[PDB]
Amino acid sequence: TDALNVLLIIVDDLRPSLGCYGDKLVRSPNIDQLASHSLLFQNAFAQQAVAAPSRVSFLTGRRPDTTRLYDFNSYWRVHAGNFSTIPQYFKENGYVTMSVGKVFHPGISSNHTDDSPYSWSFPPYHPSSEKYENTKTCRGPDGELHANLLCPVDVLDVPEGTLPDKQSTEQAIQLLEKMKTSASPFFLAVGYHKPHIPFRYPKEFQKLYPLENITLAPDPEVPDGLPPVAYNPWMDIRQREDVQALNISVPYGPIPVDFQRKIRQSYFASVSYLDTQVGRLLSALDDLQLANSTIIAFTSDHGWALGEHGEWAKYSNFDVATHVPLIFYVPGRTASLPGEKLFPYLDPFDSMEPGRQSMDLVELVSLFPTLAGLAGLQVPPRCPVPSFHVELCREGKNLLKHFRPGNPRELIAYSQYPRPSDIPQWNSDKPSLKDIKIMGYSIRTIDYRYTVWVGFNPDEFLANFSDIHAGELYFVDSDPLQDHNMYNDSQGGDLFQLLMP
Ligand SMILES: *[C@@H]1O[C@H](CO[C@@H]2O[C@@H](C)[C@@H](O)[C@@H](O)[C@@H]2O)[C@@H](O[C@@H]2O[C@H](CO)[C@@H](O)[C@H](O)[C@H]2NC(C)=O)[C@H](O)[C@H]1NC(C)=O
Ligand SMILES: *[C@@H]1O[C@H](CO[C@@H]2O[C@@H](C)[C@@H](O)[C@@H](O)[C@@H]2O)[C@@H](O[C@@H]2O[C@H](CO)[C@@H](O)[C@H](O)[C@H]2NC(C)=O)[C@H](O)[C@H]1NC(C)=O
Ligand SMILES: *[C@@H]1O[C@H](CO)[C@@H](O[C@@H]2O[C@H](CO)[C@@H](O)[C@H](O)[C@H]2NC(C)=O)[C@H](O)[C@H]1NC(C)=O
Ligand SMILES: *[C@@H]1O[C@H](CO)[C@@H](O[C@@H]2O[C@H](CO)[C@@H](O)[C@H](O)[C@H]2NC(C)=O)[C@H](O)[C@H]1NC(C)=O
Ligand SMILES: *[C@@H]1O[C@H](CO)[C@@H](O[C@@H]2O[C@H](CO)[C@@H](O)[C@H](O)[C@H]2NC(C)=O)[C@H](O)[C@H]1NC(C)=O
Ligand SMILES: *[C@@H]1O[C@H](CO)[C@@H](O)[C@H](O)[C@H]1NC(C)=O
Ligand SMILES: *[C@@H]1O[C@H](CO)[C@@H](O)[C@H](O)[C@H]1NC(C)=O
Ligand SMILES: [Ca+2]
């Protein structure tokens, strides 16, 4: 009798544009193969659609209003409370905990040390080639180097001749080989960068998605019923040279159709590129015969809009920005134990069945208790309200029962996002704490998304639910794309019904 290892794979800005989530265009065979042996959650949502608030949230198992981290300019242990993290908890329980790539968000939000010395057994590994993503590293048709958003590259014509996710993969495999020697179990966090911008990927993956067979988003127009407060102006992508040359109007655009299809091409290519890296990682796991002793959790920190509602990037409460993939492989539980190989590398350039599936509405803040339980450790207790004074507790439910009384909150996935004003402006994507004046709280059920943009006081961290600036109500059955806001024609009977037993 032993304890199970954990391989946690986190992808930056990955929406569920994957074969195992019903996307019949994107080629993600290795992830689909992971899913075929796993439990796939169809309705998983991040608590805030931006890197640091989301990552600090689900790494401490607390919600953004407990971490009080809505930007990326505060360290929770000083700002809110000495909240313990997932890897810290495993390390305290005899695990060797290791971080590769972007797990914590770098900078102050992790105290510049990836939350050292609490979380990791040794200083995390960050791939060196990441620092060239936003340099003049994209060779154009006329032979010059540019800092382009769409950046298909020959690996032999970039600095250091590699890419950050290839480095992360290589280093993760080596650590797995080392741990096969150790007597202790491992908790390995691998944080992949793509499809986060820029779209710098091996140019061969671009051939998988010819532009002729690329369509726009189903709802590329900005909906009439979308209140301006809920619109994000996607300012970060406007700084890239190729984007800047199009002279796209601020803040509503639109992006020229041809470039919209090119963005989707490069995003899909980056996903397939990501998929091969995951393939290499999982295939190495198989060769080392760790498949029968290692939990694999695969998810993302938030989504990314590709023209839906005239939006791009995250910084939103729409499903496209909050809906994330979430897959759990549990040896001998989600699939039969394996010289059998479960994750052989699959080549997307070669032209499966859905594994277990769950439609329950779940939240990234439930990641902490789930992994702790699945690994055989003690599940931290539920948090009180507030829990600033508590170091180890969880505000989300454990999903372990789901692998074989109706509280209304078990029917909800919560999301939120701040705004500095009602009209989209320069900092509406990523407002700093002092500049936050509105907080958009969103409720997502199997039936609808209900959002209210309410007055917010950043000095007291106080929401005023009597100062509603605007509201949104989208119905899954009739309006899955969320194009027809029904909040003005509503009275609140949907919330009442949810409360009534
Ligand atoms: C913040 O907490 C860390 C670690 O918290 C540990 O885990 C919690 C679940 C709870 O059981 C705590 O009592 C545990 O200590 C603190 O780090 C410890 O600090 C003490 C002395 O300060 C030291 O002797 C221990 O070795 C440290 N352990 C670890 C794992 O780092 C830290 O001090 C706390 N910081 C503040 C400001 O309270
Ligand atoms: C919390 O909000 C209430 C209500 O907000 C008011 O109504 C909104 C629709 C919008 O018009 C806001 O600008 C309004 O303030 C606040 O209640 C108001 O309080 C002020 C000062 O005490 C008073 O002059 C107003 O008459 C009140 N309005 C109502 C409708 O009661 C309340 O002050 C807010 N609380 C905090 C802590 O900011
Ligand atoms: C976050 O890290 C910084 C630096 O690593 C800590 O600030 C100082 O760090 C040095 C270590 O080089 C210590 O000797 C000092 O005592 C630290 N100063 C203070 C005021 O603590 C900082 O403390 C860390 N934050 C937390 C919450 O532990
Ligand atoms: C929902 O109703 C609100 C108010 O009932 C609308 O907001 C108003 O818009 C008019 C312009 O048509 C402004 O003059 C008012 O000042 C606004 N009201 C407030 C309180 O600011 C809103 O446009 C409606 N939305 C939809 C989709 O019908
Ligand atoms: C997982 O499977 C591998 C091979 O599929 C098992 O490898 C054995 O490991 C034990 C000690 O861990 C060795 O004594 C054996 O020689 C290995 N090979 C075989 C064929 O048994 C491994 O034990 C399995 N892990 C668990 C927890 O059962
Ligand atoms: C688009 O897909 C169809 C279906 O396989 C294929 O025949 C066609 O060649 C594709 N488009 C291009 C430009 O190759
Ligand atoms: C961008 O467009 C505006 C009006 O649409 C025009 O005035 C301006 O000169 C354009 N800039 C460039 C660099 O073409
Ligand atoms: Ca992100």
UniProtKB/Swiss-Prot annotation:
Record-linked SUPFAM superfamilies: Alkaline phosphatase-like
Effect of E308K: In MPS2; severe form
Reported impact of P53L: In MPS2; intermediate to severe forms
Recorded consequence of changing G107V: In MPS2; no significant enzyme activity
Effect the entry attributes to changing A313V: In MPS2; mild/severe form
Stated consequence of mutating R55H: In MPS2; intermediate/severe form; higher affinity for the artificial substrate; poor transport to lysosomes
Impact upon substituting L281P: In MPS2; severe form
Impact reported for G307D: In MPS2; mild form
Phenotype upon changing G303E: In MPS2; severe from
Record-given protein name: Iduronate 2-sulfatase 42 kDa chain
Species name: Homo sapiens (Human)
